[PDB]
Write a protein that binds this DNA or RNA. Sequence first.
RNA 1: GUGUCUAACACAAGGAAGUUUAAGGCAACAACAGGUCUGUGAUGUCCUUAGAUGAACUAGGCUGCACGCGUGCUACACUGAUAUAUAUAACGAGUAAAAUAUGCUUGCAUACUUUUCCUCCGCCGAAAGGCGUAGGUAAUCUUUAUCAAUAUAUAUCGUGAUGGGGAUAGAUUAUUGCAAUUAUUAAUCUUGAACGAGGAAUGCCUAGUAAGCAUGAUUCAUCAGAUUGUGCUAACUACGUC
Lengths: 41, 48, 98, 128, 138, 96, 154, 180
Amino acid sequence: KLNHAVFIVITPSAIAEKYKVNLSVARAVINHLADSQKLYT
Amino acid sequence: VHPKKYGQGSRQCRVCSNKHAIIRKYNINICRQCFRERADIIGFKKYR
Amino acid sequence: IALTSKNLRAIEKVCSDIMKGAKEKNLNVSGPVRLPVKTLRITTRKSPCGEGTNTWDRFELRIYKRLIDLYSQCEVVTQMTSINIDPVVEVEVIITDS
Amino acid sequence: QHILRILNTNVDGKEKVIIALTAIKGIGKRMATVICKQANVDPTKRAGELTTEEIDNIVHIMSTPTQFKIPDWFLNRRKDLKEGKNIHVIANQLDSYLREDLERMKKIRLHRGLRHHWGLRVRGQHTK
Amino acid sequence: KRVQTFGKKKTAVAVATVTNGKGLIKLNGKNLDLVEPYILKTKVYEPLWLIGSGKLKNLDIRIRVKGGGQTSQIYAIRQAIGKGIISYYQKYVDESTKKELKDVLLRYDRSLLVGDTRRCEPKKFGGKGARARYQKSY
Amino acid sequence: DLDKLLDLSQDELIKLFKARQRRKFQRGISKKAKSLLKKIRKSKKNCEPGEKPNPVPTHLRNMTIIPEMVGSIVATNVEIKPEMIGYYLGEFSITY
Amino acid sequence: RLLEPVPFVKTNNCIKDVDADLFIRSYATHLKLHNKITYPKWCTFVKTGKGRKLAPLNEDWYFIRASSILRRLYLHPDIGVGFLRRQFSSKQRRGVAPNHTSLASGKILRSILQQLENLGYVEQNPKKKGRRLTTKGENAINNFARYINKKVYN
Amino acid sequence: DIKLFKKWSYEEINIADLSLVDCIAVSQKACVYTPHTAGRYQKKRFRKALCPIVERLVNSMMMHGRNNGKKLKAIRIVAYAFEIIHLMTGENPLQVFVNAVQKGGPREDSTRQAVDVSPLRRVNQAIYLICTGARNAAFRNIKSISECLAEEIINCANESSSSYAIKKKDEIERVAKANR
RNA sequence: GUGUCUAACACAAGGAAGUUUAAGGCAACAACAGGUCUGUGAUGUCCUUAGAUGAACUAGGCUGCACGCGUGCUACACUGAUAUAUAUAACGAGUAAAAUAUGCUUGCAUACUUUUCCUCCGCCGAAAGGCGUAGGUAAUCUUUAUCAAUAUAUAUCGUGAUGGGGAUAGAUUAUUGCAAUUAUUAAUCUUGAACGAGGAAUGCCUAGUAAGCAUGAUUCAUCAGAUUGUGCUAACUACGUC
């Protein structure tokens, strides 16, 4: 809903709620950790 | 007279000269009301 | 030699006869190849004025094609086919090697 | 910060650079897409990170797109009969061109004009 | 050299050609790997796992599939694989072993051994479906 | 604008025109329209400022506006405007 | 998934060893690295089908489309322009009417096909009609297939 | 050897109401590597009672407006949901799913009087209840369908008031209690 | 097992199939003042038959729009859209005029050659489409041992009438036709409405069905949101009762 910040476990909805970011930003956060319905398990 | 090498008035039933309802499939020019009379003598059989 | 009819029985009968005829003059034949059936299919509303129920029936005029072919000179096959025929079967001859 | 004012009267920031631009005019997206590529904005990024140069580039393209490599068929608005060139509209120019078209139909007393004057369809109601 | 057997669901038909070989399995122009959905790949690997791959490495398999869509084709392929395994074991191996093998497959399911019996019911006038009607009114 | 439009050739006029108009001129003027146009040309040239051209026995709606047509009353009735180029009559429709 | 414990012997030499998509994306990246082809001009303003109404969104698309064309060429050596149009075909949204099939943009397809012919990896057969790969084209695809096969293996 | 999704053996379950055990597909011939089998269930009354429970669950899940017949995604969603349960709690996801089906099944129903419900009917309603809750949670919401399904299953297994399946099951039973 | 233990039913096993294997075609007796004389050179009577209610030609009209009801389509979104990618099918259907040439002043007069239906292919065209030509009387060539779309995968939205949605409207260049205007039909850009899952009511459906997704044929000079077929994706729920 009001989630929008660029800068201030794995599951993108959970990341997006907890850190107050979009799921698009959450997927970016997952990729940053790592360094469609594709697995992250 | 007006051009009739296209459009509805260019075509009519062979049997009875009807101005509507003509079956032009397989290029025989017969209206369905005529066709049901003659389909057996033309050769057609029914199964469905 | 290609055999066409819209008469099922007549094409079937002629085929057996021409094969029998072929062995009489001892010709080298390939066994009769029945070619895919061609149907003139007409889907017709039963009501003549189109009033009442939407009743449709499907009429079929089914034409039969068959092929039997021969390694022979032209003269024997043409003479044998020409004598043996029945009127509703339409026949065409196809030329072959010596 | 996370926002920017967009020239031609819109305020955006969470929105993607195409999504902000489209939400003005060029909302059929293809016009916006060519403008974004021409401008050199990052199309996957959000509008609150845009520079003044990027905005200025977009306005320059919007005002004159014929100098850029966008095709004549690709541009909105075309001949319109009259000698003074009519290629490309957008915004108040689009409104003005529509008003001029409506006035011209009315002046003619064209069937479509009359129907616009009535406030009703070009094709007819078809019994509703 | 070579033995042939088959599978048939809906329009689809899969003929499987089982040759003496080294453990290659093909589907027309494709390796057996390239099914695409993980679920339907697993279904055709299933009889291979139920026998075990160390009992299949003396034969090469090529399969040719025509007709139907993907789900129908994979069941036709699974039948063709089933019958392929069985025909090799009757023709080269041993008939008593083939009956024993067939029993294990059959207890698991009859579906690979005997294909699907379902076939389309033809459309009739007065509705989109076979039996279904356009809406009645008063 | 208008002076150049009057000057220019038929090939140029079709090229300036929208494709529907261009296709019509390419397909053919025929009898009807040309015959009416010649009568309209003669009537306009030979008249003083005042009363206008008359209808045609075939009551045509099938011809569009061309740059010499202007100020003529068409065949039921409407008068062609200066800026009406390519846009047809719109005439003989009916309302509530 | 990406690495699989298959119950059978794979070929390890040809286009059916490797995943089609992985091959297409990887080969497209190689084509871009190589500098094999360019748009040209008109191809910048495309949409694959008419109803798409956006530019191709994944940015590396032209090389991907070219690479996808090359894979189909290996499969079928009898191809012509109409085959490419049908292959890349999709559904077209008719608005307030149901969808119907519509052929892909033909000029960009023709451009890629002709440009590849000029660069020597495909050859028009006028007798026994259709573009096929050249042996040089086939060898390059096979070499790339072996390289990818080696990469999946190690 | 045989395991669902290549990872869940599923050869052992707990008693529940005992009635459930006959229906559920725990036996080695009814357990499978992946659900899709699509049998013929119209021969007679008890033919459908022999269905694999995971196939029954995906078929139940897939029907809903735009989604109708999208079976492979429904398998992937159930596979993902079981993975979510496996991460969230150390119990086997299948066992938790069995507990959810036990909890989701009401034991009474009614007409204008109250009546008992058969074991087959209880199982069919329970599966339906789990999928309807997941579907209701999913539609017009940020949460994933897999996430909704997994949460509905664990909460129904728990016997939570948050569960749509428990809330519906309680409501059906409450209406039965009201009627008598 | 149950059954006069007959006729036969029920369950299991066998089996490709067990309900008559599944679906059609098929269509008594006797009616209805049901519909059609807007199909007939089937037809009575009555009307009409030369400033014709016949044949034919030119427009306009059948669709206009305060408004009421049928039937479909498209929608109302993240189990989805958007962009790329993988996979794949069955039924089909395919013969009197144009072009080119000559004499005369666009037009008039004459000849002659073939165009004619499906389109491969090759160039040109964003796109529609254009031009050059090939093969086909057809299991052969179009084209169908491969022509489809939902499926499904990776990416992009991150859920907000929103990038869902395409009403409504403007400028185009094309295609068919004598004529396209009351958007014929086509594409390009732009314009970006309602619709937040539907009251009282009511439809269809028991196994490849129901539903979803396509697509051939019919009318056709020109066109599917229609009908009729055909395939694929493949459910639920009783398995009975008045």
